[PDB]
Design a protein around this ligand. Structure first.
Ligand code: HEM
Ligand SMILES: CC1(C)[C@H]2CC[C@]1(C)C(=O)C2
Ligand SMILES: [K+]
Length: 405
């Protein structure tokens, strides 16, 4: 149920939003979150759900809060409170100045030059998976492409066996969209139980994979400890297994429902980079936040030391103060404004690898299967959380319209 109102929270600012189960969920998850941006609702509200916390609802306030690490700390970034307390991943659980040194090391394994290195295998794998599904006339897109494609690339990058994917994917999902069988703390500890033996193994026998580079790496001179390497590798696992996976499915659900947008990109495959950005704005999917270090008056509201505030990256680009007609997808938008990959000092390091997996998917899929639909009568359901997603996505096409390349 609800959590009792704190003394400092005025009554006219209460709007009971549940981020794990929004009441408008059937209309789509972005639409369900967009109810916070209607005429009746203020820029900053308090919900009594999930222990009780603030939510900033506007792009202006979300950008402002992510720039100010002094008042708004990363130490406790997840809601509910006990998930945020247990959270100790690197570099996401630290503020500047100390987080900055770990960023350069993580950038060695997921940054731009490693993307260039992988580009040939990313190409190879997409074409292979799509050419396999092509004669079939149908697929559950989430199972058949959206999961195997990003995840297999990450397991290659990190040098882990493919047979381990089911176990790891399950644990990751409990951290982002819990079903109640595991607490955040139990999920995290089980991921660490997996990593520790492997990090010890590649510290005595180094390879060229991602885990070997992190474990044998250096932060601003000094050798990195086994503990820090475990906490950095934990984040990379979560990021590689539950981000692009979920976004690909939102993008393809839209494309199956809009043959005009599908056609524009077939006619002009050079607009596909630009299309990628608009889809990232419209189908943004991440929402975490920050904790108040002191009492602070933020835009005429009293925040108290210890309060959690959810600062949904998702909402910035759906805000009509930033983009006009925000629920409409337009590939020739003049300025595409979002904070899909974050804002401030914690800007997503894997964003280059993300965009390449997205752009290669669009180009290579439309090139082979230009005409497809949602399976008729099937109702598409979303799920909300720290990272939102899609439960299933049955597609159908007719194999005579396809092209073997
Ligand atoms: C659709 C794809 C993706 C989205 C929307 C996304 C979103 C984000 C967001 C919002 C943050 C900031 C978190 C915060 O401020 O608390 C972030 C950080 C981060 N992401 Fe991503 N991400 C994506 C893909 C990836 C991938 C594929 C990886 C690579 C394994 C990854 C690795 C990281 C890392 C290492 C950080 C931590 C950076 C730091 O704290 O300094 N992300 N991402
Ligand atoms: C997307 C992410 C990698 C980023 C925000 C949520 C996430 C799952 C993390 O724990 C950090
Ligand atoms: K913490």
């Amino acid at each position: 149920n609800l959590a009792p109102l704190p003394p400092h929270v005025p009554e006219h600012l209460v709007f009971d939003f549940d981020m794990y189960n929004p009441s408008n969920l059937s209309a789509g998850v972005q639409e369900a979150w967009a109810v916070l941006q209607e005429s009746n609702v203020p820029d900053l509200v308090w919900t009594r759900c999930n222990g009780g916390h603030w939510i900033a609802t506007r792009g202006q306030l979300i950008r402002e809060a992510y720039e100010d690490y002094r008042h708004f700390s990363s130490e406790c970034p997840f809601i509910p409170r006990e998930a945020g307390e247990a959270y100790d991943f690197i570099p996401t659980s630290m503020d500047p100045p100390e987080q900055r040194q770990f960023r350069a090391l993580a950038n060695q394994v997921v940054g731009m030059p490693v993307v260039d290195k992988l580009e040939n295998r990313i190409q190879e794998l997409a074409c292979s998976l799509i050419e396999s599904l092509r004669p079939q006339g149908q697929c559950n897109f989430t199972e058949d492409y959206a999961e195997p494609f990003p995840i297999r690339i990450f397991m290659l990058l990190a040098g882990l066996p493919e047979e381990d994917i089911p176990h790891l994917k399950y644990l990751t999902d409990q951290m982002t969209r819990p079903d109640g069988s595991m607490t955040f703390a139990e999920a995290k500890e089980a991921l660490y139980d997996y990593l520790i033996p492997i990090i010890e193994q590649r510290r005595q026998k180094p390879g060229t994979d991602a885990i070997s580079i992190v474990a044998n790496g250096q932060v601003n001179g000094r050798p990195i400890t086994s503990d820090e390497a475990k906490r950095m590798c934990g984040l990379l696992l979560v990021g590689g297994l539950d981000t692009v996976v979920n976004f690909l499915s939102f993008s393809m659900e839209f494309l199956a429902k809009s043959p005009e947008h599908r056609q524009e990109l077939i006619q002009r495959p050079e607009r596909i980079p630009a299309a990628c950005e608009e889809l990232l704005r419209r189908f943004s999917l991440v929402a975490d936040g920050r904790i108040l270090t002191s009492d602070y008056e933020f835009h005429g509201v009293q925040l108290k030391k210890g309060d959690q505030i959810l600062l949904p990256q998702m909402l910035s680009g759906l805000d009509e103060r930033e983009n006009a007609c925000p629920m409409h997808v337009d590939f020739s938008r003049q300025k595409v404004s979002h904070t899909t990959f974050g804002h401030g000092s914690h800007l997503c390091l894997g964003q280059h690898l993300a965009r390449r997996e997205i752009i290669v998917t669009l180009k290579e899929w439309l090139t082979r299967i230009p005409d497809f639909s949602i399976a008729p009568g099937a109702q598409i359901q979303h799920k909300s959380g720290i990272v939102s997603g899609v439960q299933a996505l049955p597609l159908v096409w007719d194999p005579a319209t396809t092209k073997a390349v």
